[PDB]
DNA sequence: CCGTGTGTGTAAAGAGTGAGGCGTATGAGGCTGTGTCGGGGCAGAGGTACTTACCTGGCAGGG
């Protein structure tokens, strides 16, 4: 399994393909609003913080 | 008269929940012990009609 792995392969788990479901595609788009979000936030969280420390 | 454009069977995926049994984990029980801490009483400050009597306002005199 090693050698196959290397030089190339694809177990068949790897190339199982679900069609996707209605809502799936709303739970990505509201995923990655959410960590758009996130990570737009921590910057501003952690400046503030510092600056109550301060 | 042979092109093609649409239908159809029926189990095969595709999810989509849902269910059931089993196996592991947990508990409860005295026991005995030892540090500790919330706890839970524990009392405690501390905040219907008629008649008679009594009180008040008034006008009156007195000095």
């Not at 068949?12 to 609003?33: C, G, I, M, P």
Request: net charge positive.
């Amino acid at each position: 399994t090693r050698e196959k792995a290397a030089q190339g392969i694809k177990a068949f788990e790897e190339l199982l393909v679900t069609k996707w479901k209605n809502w799936e595609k709303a739970l990505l788009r509201k995923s990655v609003v959410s960590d758009r979000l996130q990570r737009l936030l921590q910057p501003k969280l952690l400046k503030l913080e510092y600056l109550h420390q301060k």
